[PDB]
Structure formats: C-alpha cells, structure tokens
Amino acid sequence: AKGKLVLGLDIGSTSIKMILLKEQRKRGEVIYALQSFGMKPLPPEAIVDGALMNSTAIVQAVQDLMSELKVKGKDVAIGVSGHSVIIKKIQMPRMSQDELEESIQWEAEQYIPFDVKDVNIDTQILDGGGNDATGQMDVLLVAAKKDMINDYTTVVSEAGLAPVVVDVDAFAVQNMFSVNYDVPERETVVLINAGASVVNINIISNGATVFTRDVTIGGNQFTEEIQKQLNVSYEEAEALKIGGNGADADAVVPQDVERVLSSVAEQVAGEIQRSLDFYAGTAADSNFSKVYLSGGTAKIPALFKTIEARTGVPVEILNPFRKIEVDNRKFDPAFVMDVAPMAAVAVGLALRRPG
Amino acid sequence: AKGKLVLGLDIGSTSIKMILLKEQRKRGEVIYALQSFGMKPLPPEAIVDGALMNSTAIVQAVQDLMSELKVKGKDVAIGVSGHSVIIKKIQMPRMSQDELEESIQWEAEQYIPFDVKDVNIDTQILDGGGNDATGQMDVLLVAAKKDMINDYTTVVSEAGLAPVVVDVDAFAVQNMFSVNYDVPERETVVLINAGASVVNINIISNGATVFTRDVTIGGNQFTEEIQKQLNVSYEEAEALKIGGNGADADAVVPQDVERVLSSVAEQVAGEIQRSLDFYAGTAADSNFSKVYLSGGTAKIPALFKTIEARTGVPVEILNPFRKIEVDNRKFDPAFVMDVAPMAAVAVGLALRRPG
Amino acid sequence: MMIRINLLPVRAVKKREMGRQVLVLFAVVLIGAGVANYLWYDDRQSELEAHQAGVAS
Amino acid sequence: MDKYLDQFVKAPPAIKFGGLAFVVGALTAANFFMVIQPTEEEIGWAVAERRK
C-alpha cells in the first residue's frame, strides 16, 4: 500500500537522526511538510567498520528516536554506510531488463573484492529511453555485503520498523537540493557531505550526478587529533572541537586547537584537490562553478572559507529544509537552519519516503 | 479489601523512611492527612547493587520503623532500586490486553540483558481509549530480576507487612507534585531526584511523563570524594558534607571541601547536560521551562543555584507535603519542609497506598 | 537524480529458489520410494493368498 | 538477540523444510524395511506349511 514511511540517519556514527515529513493541510491546501525530527548521539561499539555489530542495542536507540518523535509511523527508508558500499560507474549495452541486470552483475564481479555475497543495484546516469538497444548504456552500481544489509534489516526489524528503501547517503543528501539544482541545468555543482566516518563528494550537471568519491577522512580525524594532542577522551575532545573552535571567546584556543587540527586541514584539502583533479578530464580548459556543504564536520568554524580559497570553488552551506513546508508555530527557522547540515540526509531519504 | 496500606523508602540506601497518611477527620470533614513518618539510616551491607543481600536484617530495621511510627497498619507499598529496574519506552499496536502483554514481553526481550527471569509491567504514555486497535500504542516497560523482587518481598514478609504495590521511585516521587503539575497542562517540567545511589531525571508535559533517565552519580560520590581527600570514614565524610557545607560558620571549609567535591559537581553537571541534550530532539528551536528537586543529595548547599545557572533551567526545591493535610499540633511545618526532599518518595507510594 | 535501493533482491532470491528446488527433489524421491513400498505390498498380499490356499490344502 | 533472529527470518524456511525432508526420508526407510520383513516371515510360513 501507499505509505508515508520514515527516515533515520542510521549510518551517522556520531548521531542517529530521524525525520517525519508528510502531507500537511493548511487552508484546504496540502504539501509535504516537516512533522517531526529527532537526534540521539550513537553509543560507541554499535557500529564498527560500517557494519552494525550490536543490532539489538542500536534498536534500543532507534526506538528512543521514534517515541521522542511521537510518531505513529512504522515504515522507514534508511541508508547504508559509505564505508559499507561500493559506488562506481559502469558502461554496458542497452537491452532487456533481465539481460542488463545479469550483464551488470557480471561486470561488477571483478570490481567487488568479495564473493557475491553482495547486494547489487544500478541506476542509469542518462535516460534509457533516449538511446536504442545495444547502444549508450551507462549504469552506476551500488554494491554491498549481505552481512551489512542483514545487520541493518536486523536493527530495523527489531525497532518495529519495516524498510522499503535502503538508499545511499551521497545521493540521499541531494534530494533536498534537487529542485534548486534542477534550476541550473548546465551548471556543474559539487556537493560535499563531511560526516564523522567519511566525506563524500558528488559532482553534478544540474541534478544529474556525474560522479561520486568517498574519502576516509572526516570529523573523527579532527576530534582524534585534538584527543592525541591533549590526552583527552573522545567526547571532551569533540566538545573542544565544537565550542572550542567557534565561540566568541575562543581567541586563545585557535592557536592551541588549530595547531592540533592543522595537519588534518592540510590532508583534507589535499585529498579534495586530488579528487577534483581526478575528475577534471574532458573540460581541460575550464574552471569550476559552485558547491554546497552538508554534514556536521562541515560546521568547523571557517572551514567553508578555507575550502573556498583552497579548492578554487565557492563552497557554501545550504539549508535543506527549504524543500519542505515548516510550520513556524512548531519549529523556529533559526535552529532548523542550525542543524540543517547534520540533517540533510535525515530529510533526504525522507523525501524518498512519501515518494 | 480496601485498605490504607503504608509506605517505606526501601531503596533509600542512605535511609529507610516510612510514612502513614490516612482519612483524617476534623469538624465532620475528612481528607488525606499525614499520620506518622519515620526515618532510620540504612545499615550498610543490607543493600548491595540494588539487591537485598540480606532480607532478615533489613526486616529488623523496617520493624523499628513501624514501632517508631506507632502504626497499626501492616500493608505496604514500596519501591525497587533504580539500579534494579530497567525503565524504557516501547512502541506497539493497540489490541486486546493479552496480545499487548505478550507482544510487550516479546519486544522487551532483547532490551533486558538477563533471561526472563524478569518481572515486567507497562503503562501507556497516552490514554489507550483515545486510539483504535492496531494504531498508536505506546507503553513504557518497567523490568526487574526476580531475585530483587524476591529479596524485597522477603524483607516485607518478615516485617509482618503485606505488599500490594511494588512501584518505581522516579514516578512515585511525582505523586506529591501531580496536582501542581496538572495545573499547567502544556508546560514541560523536569524533576530531578538526587539520591544516594542514583539520580533520576523524569521530564513531563503536565503530569504526563515524557521520559526518564537514571544516572549512576549521586550523593555517595560526593561523600566518597570527601572521604578520599581526607582519609575519613564514610559517616564522618558524610557529616562533613552535610554540616560542613551549609553552616553559617563554614567560611573556611568550602575551599577544603569544594575543592574536594568540584570534580563531582563538574561530572554531575555534564551528565545532566548530556541527558537533557539527548532528550531535546523534536523541539529543535525551543528552551526549557521549570523544574524541581527531590532527594537528600539535592540539599547540597547552593547546588540548586549551580544547576539553575548550568542547565539553563530554573531548578527549585519543592515541598511534597502540600498534597496532604498536616495537623500543626502534631507536626510543625518548618522541619517537615526540612526533610521534604528526602521524604518525597516516602510520601509518594504513600498516596499510592490509600488510592 | 539517482534513486537507489539496496533493499534485498538477488542473493536471498537465489537461495529461496534453491530452497524450493531441493524440496521438490525430496518430494519426487519420496513419492517414488512410496510407489516402490506399495508395489512390494501387493506382491506380498498375493503371496499371502497363495500360501493361505496351501494351508487350506 | 536479533542478528540470529533475522538469520532466522532469511534462512530457516529452507532449514525447517530440509529437516522435515530428512525426517520423511527416514520414515520411508523404516516403512520399507517394515514391508521387507513380513516378506521374509511370509516365505518362512510358506516353508513350514508346505512341510506340513
């Protein structure tokens, strides 16, 4: 049946977040609108290497999410870990669906360092109806171990939730910006999601993904450098990162901290430069246009100006919540804006769920 | 038959307290009223890890309570240890009572790190009559080992007492404030009970609990830091805490003591901030309202102002005894006020007992 | 925009199918063995009738 | 514990069916043996009767 499911940030690693939008009625009109959202930091040991090592416990957390939410709904879309999925482009020939799925599996086979023992899904980077059989096939494959998917369906089964879509974060984060991207149909845009476990880059023409690349570096690395240089626990080093780096009174601490985080800033900048250079192969001659940031690791004070000057691209924070109606009597736009970067995916597969 | 039972503070750890209210007659009118109360510090070794390591001795204490009280009554409500109970929310579907109890057990099963081997009880966070079958079920489960319950029924059986209700302290402490909470039906209130073994937070809209969380930190930690820093016995460190921290002549001792207790003050503040942040997930944008304190650990001098400034919430002591009639010829309001925080639960399951 | 869904198709499907086929094979073998046990029972009832004729003799 | 429980929602249709099948195979072995033995007994009673 046609349900409006729900949306968790299941591979937040730092935080399990969840969002409910639905058909909100005002004055006889109805549109998608924010109904609830919820956030709880992920207890350690629940996720290791992108897999759910403690399914039942993560369940306890998710159920806390749902009751905090005060939500009736028990269907969910969610996402796999960027560390748990291989995303990559694949060229084939256009044919019948079965022959494409089998051919797709066959070509992925070498590119997957595991047996299959793999869950596979593709989508075509260009519309298949625009080309004939045998010509101009391009699918991109998302590939994953059963043990990961099975871990996640475990967690979901036990929260009393029923999954309908297991999506991927680099593209789920885009659904909030897809209209605004579809406004410029020939502009090349970059989208960085700097998370706690991984940083994704996806770069597009319009809301047509051209490619994606996932970098092991993330906010965990900043926190871990802070922790190393002041023998601090992870959580206190995390707080020192957050409030340490951005307070109006922080004038004495960007020496002590920035000197700690400077190697990470350098290595992130070099890895992003490297990724951009590895893309930039047919437009020899050109430059970039504009880009956005998502993920809480983005919120590092001044990091946006640094990435802007260092990558030669205007990098801007963006408010996902502009894609959904927000009742000002139930949510104030200021904070909603404040947690927009963390919640981008969390409302991402969320517009996926009343699709 | 319809009895007016009694009320002990069985998991006081620092103190076994007991209260008798009943239908008091004055001028042809009758209302609930305080009849007696009694307090004896707990013989240590009687409770270990929230269990009655020894029913029989605790029995001797409880019977001292009853004779001190001068009470005819031999029926009792009591409470389990916060360390002995798992309290947590649970989402299900509304149906027949049997199907809900079994379904409830089934969902709790993973969330209980023991076999069942567990006594289980739920109540619905919203009225069940307000929703149809299959939709909008929410119970919260209280779960406990048999060995604990059996320890307690042991102690009770031997004091000559008969239990009718084995309640939980985080909610029993609220029955004194339930009317005053029901006065603001949409205000979000926090209630902290800082005990000797545990600190509970329950936060409500009206007298409708929204959640509870139990923190291992408590007054025992303050006493134990005082003991560590001056190689004192537990009892003398406890007295130094009590009178040391609050006398008018204490001007020289809040350096010696406060420096001892400062790490505990910090860690308590951080744990309370953490709990509050882990709740605060649907009202992104909002702030707190008002809150109360119960438990003797609250009575730390100035702790209320500290928690008020540190948590961003007005935290106030409150007099439970306002819910019951008090004959000024048998009790003077000043002291009654003085031991109100310790006795909040002690009159809590006490209004539970002429229910 | 790319819309992907790793919610379980192929490997479970292949295993549910293999699970079906192994059971059909079990069923076929057991029906055949059944028919053998039968046919045997009939030759045995015939032999019993011949022998009871002899006993009458 | 739930990881085992979803291993139980994925697979043991196959494992339960299999167990049922090994059991029915055993029972058919047993009844075939229990029809072979009355054959031998019957040839025996033949050999007695003819000797009478």
From TrEMBL, chains A, B:
Q: Which organism is it from?
A: Myxococcus xanthus (strain DK1622)
Residues in a coiled coil are none
**Known SUPFAM superfamilies for this protein?**
Actin-like ATPase domain
Q: Output this protein's name.
A: Type IV pilus biogenesis protein PilM
All copies of the SHS2 domain together span: 6-179
Keyword annotations for this protein?
ATP-binding, Nucleotide-binding
- Record-linked NCBIfam families: pilM
Identify the residues that bind ATP.
196-198, 296
Endpoints of the signal sequence: none
Q: Name one GO biological process term.
A: cell division
Q: Which domain of life is it from?
A: Bacteria
Automatic annotation (TrEMBL), chain C:
Top-level taxon of origin = Bacteria
GO biological process annotation, one example: type IV pilus-dependent motility
Tell me the keywords, alphabetical order. Membrane, Transmembrane, Transmembrane helix
So where does this one cross the membrane?
Answer: 21-41
Tell me the protein's name: PilN
TrEMBL record, chain D:
* Top-level division of the source organism's lineage: Bacteria
The residues forming the signal peptide are none
Segments spanning the bilayer are none
Please give the name of this protein: PilO
